[PDB]
């Protein structure tokens, strides 16, 4: 499920198109998971051992990120294709 189903669900998503003209397009290309990491109150990432999750009543979970390509046309094909990494 992690290796195949997640990436396939992402790629099978219809690319979102938005219109007022300004024609915005969104696409999701690549996926990442870090190791199971606990973010403290101050946002300090630390490797979370499962026994901590038992003891501290935390959910033993890993963050998930996606590379997102946003391509905006502006009625005249001046395409700005930005990419956001590890979103």
């Amino acid at each position: 499920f992690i290796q195949m189903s997640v990436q396939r669900i992402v790629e099978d998503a219809p690319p979102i198109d938005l219109q007022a003209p300004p024609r915005y397009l969104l696409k999701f290309e690549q996926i990442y998971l870090s190791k199971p990491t606990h973010w403290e109150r101050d946002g300090a990432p630390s490797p979370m051992m499962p026994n901590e999750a038992r003891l501290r009543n935390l959910t033993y979970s890993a963050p998930l990120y996606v590379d997102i390509t946003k391509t905006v046309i502006k009625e005249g094909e001046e395409q700005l294709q930005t990419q956001h990494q590890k979103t």
């Binding site: 290796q3 990442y32 998971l33 963050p63 590890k86």
Partner: peptide, 16 residues
């Protein structure tokens, strides 16, 4: 296939 990241490539954006 899904790539893996190490903990050092996690920017501190979750704190901001």
């Amino acid at each position: 296939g899904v790539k893996l990241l190490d903990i050092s490539e996690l920017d501190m954006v979750g704190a901001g």
